[PDB]
DNA sequence: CGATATCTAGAGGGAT
DNA sequence: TCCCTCTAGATATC
């Protein structure tokens, strides 16, 4: 199945001032994070469908012939095209050209507005997962001065949620604050705060677009009879470059590919029974499939617990690959949830790590794994920064360990560290998870916009993984002549 | 290259004497020795194994003139490892009656290791015994041991069948046998042993004595044997003027089965006769070959497909200078939380050998970010065709050395951003004071370390990062038993495995009362529906 | 200068 | 049905 978003923007007259701010205007702010949100689902290459309505307009575009009312995208998976489209609105001019061919200020009622979504959402014919509205406006009380607006608009809401889909509003700033508690309390479905800067906005629509998906429910078993169900989760996963698919020469769909064993004598096809799998050893050892899977089995899948471990004993070098995060599945198991609790509770309070047995699936060999609990977190604006749950280490074995040659220490004199001291405090910055791209992952994607708008030149990304060498360089000023004096040799 | 390995074990008659309960160490030292040439043999190296018994019935040294060295047999000189080996190891070799001095061993295998030797190059010669120490022996030959053994540079480890520093477990946790329950002659023979590791290598002989059930979970036979890594030489920049010659080592990789499983014929178990290939058709309906001459390569960019060719592809994809370790900044290392490393290695850093000035430079930044208590954020390109990565490098300072480790950092594009709800503001899955007093007790008795000695010096139950992967000795175990017994079926996972891969019996002992309580504390049921 | 390592490309189990 | 992990095979580079 498929999960659909659309994103529903207030084109009122409000939307537009920058209340004497050197930042982006709301409807910039909307437009950008809407477009961030395309790029994102073509770099991930999800399968979501996504749509762009706006209200409030003059001009009118849809299926219902519903004044001020214009649907810009119908739900369809994100394209070149569609993020041209939509950058065509983006910055001053993109305004001025959104207001000349759609109008903005009229007259609007919420209770069509929902009533065009509930349609869009009803033409698509695909296998419908989730749906689900995202509202961008600074207007705390759209329908202040009618209360039956207000009340159609209520019941509206009332029967679209009845229906199945989500409806999940983003505030925008405004001056004298955002009131949900006003209007629109009773529509959506603690909350965030208002948006300021772009990449807030951002943080906020990704937080409730992505769904999780787990990666295995497995079973943390205490002992033989106490069992939990909990899920287990990749919070970082390492993006990869999307694999090539073959396409036909002169008219590029998509080819089918399957492989076929057959006997180089024979010719005809072979059932896996026919073969066995062969190991040589100097000149010598035969296995069946089913000895070859059976020979990696130790445990079932799950986790067992072997004991806790002070959180001192892990070290913070001995990273083997990345880690999971564990968090209940009441629907498994019931009263999952409470110990697990319990636990987490407990857990951080003696400052312990569970060490388990972690086995992912079945005829795969154990890993020693370290469940570190860690607790929720929350950002200014009431961003979740850190789940509450279980962070699963993965404990290298000793195979993992390489030994490595030794060389005498030599230690550095108090005036070189105290000048290391300086060039570190002069190259302090502040580091966040997000503060740097892929290059080839942003080139790539590059190419791919230019070749599919068929656009002469690409566009040269910026590489924000290179060091500022010149800045670096001026904001040293000459401690680097002072180190080297220091610690080099003249002849070197 | 290679290093030459002599197996030197005691067959003894008081090898074989089994205290009720607990395997005999003649049959300890045969599994000791059977997981070292099982790995030896399975890996493919080049390592040459040399094997000597002690205390055999008969007699085979190139000593024995004069009625010397006798019950001394050298079952297998100097040469790479075999099936053979492997196979009179486990059922060939059978424990003796009589008693041979543990020394005069010695000096046979010193001797094995010097004649044997001649022509080929070794990088290191190594000799490990097995033995209980539980026969009388002769020192008068002590010194020129310890002579030959320093001048010949000849490493030396021992193994007993009680460990140096309730019920007994092989490869387990803990158990050790009573030292006050040992021999006086074993007492002697230990006080010997001590002196001898002593002098070769100095307080890190004791570490070097180790025992056969201890061993059996650790790497300790192959210690002097693993080849060292290769460096990888940069340079490690901080701006642009600014440059310390660096060397890194990968401290932790994951350990992959080097050989593969080959598809063969079930009937001629040969590889030729099977053949695969890949033929293209059209996805649609009414489904058509299609010819290699028709395909062409394409990118899928959201709902468009774009045609892109190999030499585009090649020619307008990211192109980075090449090698390049480059410091982009310094931040604290509170601001870089372990849960986001990213990447399958680990690596440490080090200053270019024989290099003082960059040494003492490596050093400076070192302590300089240990001391503020800061890691820097570092670019990382193994070569100009590896895409680039960022990463942090954090200081790691020992007694013996320092460097800076570096583990990758994620991009943007690999973080998920789940929303997850709380768990301490749920009023239906908040525990009630007696579920956390349960869980308090369970965790309060199951704990893995303890605080022994009163020197405020934490002791680990359970130190999971010595004991080797378990795949590898069960898949060396499995295809050992195949090629020895082609017709019976696999055997199944060796005792000492599950009892190395378990904690230790105390606390699953202490565990018992909290773990009941908790059962009875906490319902769990399973759901039937959705 | 060639052996090591990295990017890349095919099957299989499990959540959806 | 697709995602992630595992396992093979290729190969430009130091
Ligand atoms: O049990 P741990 O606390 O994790 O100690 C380990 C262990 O050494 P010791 O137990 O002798 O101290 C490592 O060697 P193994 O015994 O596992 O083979 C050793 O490895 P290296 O010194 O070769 O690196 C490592 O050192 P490091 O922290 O540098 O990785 C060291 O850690 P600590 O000395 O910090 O305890």
């Known amino acids: 199945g498929r999960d659909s978003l659309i994103f529903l923007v207030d084109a009122s007259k409000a939307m537009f001032e920058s209340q004497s701010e050197d930042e982006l205007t709301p409807f910039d702010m909307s437009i950008q994070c809407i477009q961030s949100v395309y790029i994102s689902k073509i770099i991930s290459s999800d399968r979501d469908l996504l749509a762009v309505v706006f209200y409030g307009t003059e001009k009118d575009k849809n299926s219902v012939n519903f004044k001020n009312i214009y649907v810009l995208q119908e739900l369809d998976n994100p394209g070149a095209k569609r993020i041209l489209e939509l950058d065509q609105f983006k910055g001053q001019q993109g305004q001025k050209r959104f207001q000349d061919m759609m109008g903005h200020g009229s007259d609007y009622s919420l209770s069509e507005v929902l009533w065009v979504c509930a349609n869009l959402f009803s033409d698509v014919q695909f296998k419908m997962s989730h749906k689900r509205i995202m509202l961008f406006t600074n207007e705390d009380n759209p329908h202040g001065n009618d209360s039956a607006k207000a009340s159609r608009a209520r019941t509206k809401a009332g029967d679209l949620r009845d229906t199945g889909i989500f409806l999940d509003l983003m505030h925008l700033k405004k001056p004298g604050g955002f009131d949900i508690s006003l209007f629109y309390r009773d529509i959506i479905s603690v909350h965030f705060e208002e948006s300021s800067k772009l990449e807030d906005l951002l943080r906020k629509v990704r937080a409730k677009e992505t769904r999780k998906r787990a990666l295995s429910r497995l079973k943390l078993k205490l002992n033989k009879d106490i069992v939990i169900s909990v899920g287990i989760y990749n919070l970082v996963q390492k993006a990869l470059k999307p694999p090539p698919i073959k396409l036909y020469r002169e008219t590029n769909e998509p080819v089918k590919t399957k492989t076929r064993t057959f006997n180089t004598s024979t010719g005809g096809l072979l059932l896996p029974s026919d073969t066995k799998r062969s190991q040589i050893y100097g000149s010598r050892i035969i296995l069946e499939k089913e000895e070859t899977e059976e020979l990696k089995r130790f445990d079932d899948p799950g986790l067992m617990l072997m004991g806790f471990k002070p959180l001192v004993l892990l070290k913070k070098h001995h990273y083997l690959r990345p880690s999971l995060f564990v968090y209940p599945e009441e629907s498994l198991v019931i009263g999952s949830s409470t110990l697990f609790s319990a636990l987490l509770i407990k857990c951080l309070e003696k400052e312990v790590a569970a060490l388990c047995r972690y086995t992912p699936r079945r005829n795969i060999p154990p890993y020693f794994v370290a469940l570190v609990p860690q607790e929720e977190e929350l950002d200014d604006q009431k961003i979740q920064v850190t789940p509450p749950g279980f962070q699963l280490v993965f404990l290298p074995f000793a195979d993992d360990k390489r030994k490595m040659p030794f060389t005498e220490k030599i230690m550095a004199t108090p005036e070189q560290v105290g000048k290391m001291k300086a060039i570190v405090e002069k190259l302090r910055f502040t580091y966040r998870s997000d503060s740097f791209e892929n290059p080839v992952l942003q080139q790539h994607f590059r190419n791919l916009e230019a070749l599919a708008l068929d656009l002469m030149e690409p566009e040269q990304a910026v590489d924000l993984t290179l060091p500022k060498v010149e800045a670096m360089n001026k904001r040293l000023g000459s401690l680097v002549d002072e180190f080297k004096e220091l610690v080099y040799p003249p002849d070197y | ?530």
């Open chain 2, 1 to 530: 290259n290679k290093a030459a390995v002599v197996l030197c074990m005691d067959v003894g008659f008081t090898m074989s004497n089994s205290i009720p309960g607990i395997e005999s160490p003649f049959e300890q030292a045969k599994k000791v020795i059977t997981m070292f040439v099982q790995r030896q043999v399975f890996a493919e190296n080049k390592d040459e194994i040399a094997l000597v018994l002690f205390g055999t019935d008969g007699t085979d040294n190139p000593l024995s003139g004069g009625d010397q060295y006798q019950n001394i047999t050298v079952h297998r000189h100097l040469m790479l490892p075999d099936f053979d080996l492997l196979e009179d190891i486990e059922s060939k070799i059978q424990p003796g009656s009589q008693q041979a001095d543990f020394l005069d061993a010695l000096i046979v295998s010193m001797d094995v290791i010097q004649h044997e030797t001649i022509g080929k190059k070794f990088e290191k010669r190594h000799i490990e015994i097995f033995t209980d120490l539980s026969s009388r022996f002769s020192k008068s030959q002590l010194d020129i041991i310890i002579h030959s053994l320093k001048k010949c540079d000849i490493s030396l480890q021992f193994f007993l069948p009680f460990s140096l520093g309730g019920p007994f477990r092989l490869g387990g946790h803990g158990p050790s046998f009573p030292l006050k329950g040992i021999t006086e002659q074993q007492k002697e023979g230990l006080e010997i042993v001590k002196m001898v590791m002593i002098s070769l290598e100095g307080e890190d002989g004791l570490d070097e004595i180790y025992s056969f059930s201890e061993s059996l979970r650790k790497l300790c036979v192959f210690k002097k044997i693993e080849r060292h890594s290769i460096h990888w030489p940069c340079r490690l920049t901080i701006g642009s003027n600014l440059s310390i010659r660096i060397a890194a080592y990968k401290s932790i990789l994951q350990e992959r089965v080097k050989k593969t499983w080959t598809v063969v014929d079930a009937k001629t178990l040969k590889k030729e006769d099977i053949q695969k290939e890949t033929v293209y058709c059209l996805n649609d309906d009414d489904e058509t070959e299609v010819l290699k001459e028709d395909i062409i390569q394409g990118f899928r960019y959201g709902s468009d497909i774009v045609p892109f060719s190999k030499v585009d592809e090649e020619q307008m994809k990211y192109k980075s200078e090449g090698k390049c370790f480059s410091v982009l900044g310094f931040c604290k290392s509170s601001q870089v939380q372990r849960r986001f490393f990213m990447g399958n290695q680990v690596l440490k850093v080090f200053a270019a050998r024989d290099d003082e000035a960059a040494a003492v430079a490596l050093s400076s930044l070192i302590h300089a970010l240990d001391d503020l208590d800061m890691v820097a954020i570092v670019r990382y390109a193994y070569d100009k065709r590896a895409n680039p990565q960022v990463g942090v490098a954090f200081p790691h300072i020992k007694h013996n050395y320092e460097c800076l480790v570096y583990v990758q950092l994620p991009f943007m594009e690999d973080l998920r951003q789940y929303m997850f709800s709380s768990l301490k503001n749920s009023k239906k899955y908040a525990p009630t004071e007696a579920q956390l007093n349960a869980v308090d007790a369970l965790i309060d008795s199951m704990s893995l370390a303890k605080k022994d000695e009163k020197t405020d010096t934490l002791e680990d139950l359970f130190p999971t990062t010595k004991i080797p992967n378990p795949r590898f000795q069960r898949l060396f175990q499995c295809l050992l038993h195949r090629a020895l017994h082609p017709r019976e079926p696999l055997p199944p996972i060796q005792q000492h495995i599950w009892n190395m891969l378990n904690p230790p019996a105390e606390v699953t002992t202490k565990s018992q009362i909290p773990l009941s309580k908790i059962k009875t504390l906490f319902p769990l049921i399973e759901a039937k529906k959705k």
